[model samples]
Target: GSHKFAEKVEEIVAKNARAEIDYSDAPDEFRDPLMDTLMTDPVRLPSGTIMDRSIILRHLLNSPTDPFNRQTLTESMLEPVPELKEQIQAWMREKQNSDH
Candidate 1:
């Protein structure tokens, strides 16, 4: 039986496998501790915790507390880590070049 469900499952599995390989190649600092994925936009929290901006914002929308310390947290308290973002971008470029 040629089911579309099987095609979708295979696609998802392939995507997951690629994601796992990419994460394994990424540096720990480039990964979001909460999401366990590469951070596209990283920000520092009041508790000195760094993670993806979107992840933190989504979490704060549900519970406005530091995930690490349970202290009060707000979007205003999020500090952009521009330098870290730049480093991540540079690393991506290097990786892409090496992959070629």
Candidate 2:
């Protein structure tokens, strides 16, 4: 598992929509949400998981003027995901400390 800090996730998603995505780059957004909809009800993740999307759906289903959109997206995640944030932080720390 991995994570992108400092709005890196949002930044990456926007860049990707513009056809600038790099596959080698760890994904900040799961592959287009369309994949989620087209797939089965369980929506098993590649690692044999179905992250809770209740929050995500709330965001998608809400009224455009609703202020909860930001919070809803933020709440969606694999609650107990292993080491993603830590790994990202470690990699970042390494880069910060690396010889330059």
Candidate 3:
């Protein structure tokens, strides 16, 4: 004999209508060139191209060449963009406040 205690099966379908809100108004400098989304952690390449860090990392896993000029690149080649990140964060805070 087998017994099941406190067995409840619930199915729910949920959607976030606002999850994909548009960021078209965001500055082009704050958006990733490859992903076209807001860059959370951006890095600069030797080619002088800036993009989201994770995006380029993932790209490098498959191709270790700069997408911009096809120059050889590696994870060590990425340069931190702290200045731009600070500016982007400030802009995001301002944007959030304005939304409310």
Candidate 4:
């Protein structure tokens, strides 16, 4: 199950390279809210909402509810964001290199 999700997201991230996004135009879900930059360490909530670890930690410090589902959440319930961040970073690097 986990392997399938990772593989699927990997495909999506790689395909997204064709549509290179300017950092300034990246979506909130793709950016680390606390760092205000591309997410390097993202976490998936039990409700399947993806968020940057920094932001999730910040929110967890304040509340126990999953903002996406309004259900109880815990550190144990957080899953890794299925290999998307590294792929995005790699795509950005490739885009930059191609641009230069």
Candidate 5:
């Protein structure tokens, strides 16, 4: 009984989260958050937050602290998102087809 209720709550929360960003026709600000750095890779931060390496690197160069919390951040703490590059490529293909 309680398990179902918890699952429903999680679904509702996820739905609300997705509402913050629309994928149909997102702008740079919205789209940027969805990709890895220009190196075409994703990095999983020690904080469990994932982001594009290029974007994060730029931010890191400007300030050596965490963008999300101002805590200390470093390259050593970043982990790779192994398959995100391929996933991004797939999405690009889909987008291209839709555009044409």
Candidate 6:
């Protein structure tokens, strides 16, 4: 529980919307390695400043190459499309975590 990736995931989701992930317990201890594998460096922020998400939303707001792909790219500034899938993910996670 209280895994690093879990924190990052929580941070990211929070940055997108106002919700909660109500798991019975915290996540696993698989962060540094998971981030190393799934996360990419050179994460360019919306301010064009490349940095890590240590104290900012750098990881979540990283520039999306093509910036048009409505799937993986995180930033959806170009259009109102669900490129980052934040809305969908937030909704899904909330539903799953809800006391319902």
Report the lDDT tens digits of candidate 2 across residue range 15-100: 32334223323344333243332111223233334333443355356632223222323333324444444554444455443222
Name the runs in model 4 displaced over 4 angstroms: 1-21, 27-37, 98-100
Regions of candidate 1 where Cα sits further than 4 Å from its true position: 1-25, 98-100
TM-scores of the candidates are: 0.68, 0.25, 0.68, 0.56, 0.53, 0.16
Residues 1-100 of candidate 6: C-alpha lDDT, one tens digit per residue: 2222332334333243234334322233112222322122224444343322332244346644422332343443322223323533444466464332
Please state the error at residue 47 of candidate 3 in Å: 1.3
* Candidate 4 clashing pairs, residues 3+ apart or interchain: none
lDDT of 4 at 69: 62
Q: Which regions of candidate 5 deviate over 4 angstroms?
A: 1-39, 97-100
Give me the displacement of residue 38 in model 5, in angstroms.
9.0
Off by over 4 Å in 2: 1-78, 98-100
lDDT of 2 at 19: 46
Instruction: Write one digit per residue (lDDT tens) for candidate 3, span 1-100.
Output: 1122124433332432344433433767787876778887888888888888888767788888887788887887678989987887676776443322
User: lDDT of each structure?
Assistant: 0.70, 0.36, 0.70, 0.61, 0.56, 0.34
In model 6, the worst 10-residue window by lDDT is 29-38
Candidate 4 structure quality by residue, lDDT tens digits, 33-99: 4455676577877776666776667677888777656778788677886588776776566645333
Root mean square deviation (Cα) for candidate 4:
13.0
True-vs-predicted CA distance for residue 50, candidate 3, Å = 0.8
Count of clashes, each model:
0, 0, 0, 0, 4, 0
What is the TM-score of candidate 6?
0.16
Q: Can you give the lDDT of residue 95 in candidate 4?
A: 47
Arrange candidates by lDDT, descending: 1, 3, 4, 5, 2, 6
Once fitted onto the true fold, the runs of candidate 3 whose alpha carbons sit more than 4 angstroms away are: 1-17, 21-25, 98-100
Better of 4 and 6 by TM-score: 4
| Candidate 2 minimal-lDDT segment of 10 residues | 36-45
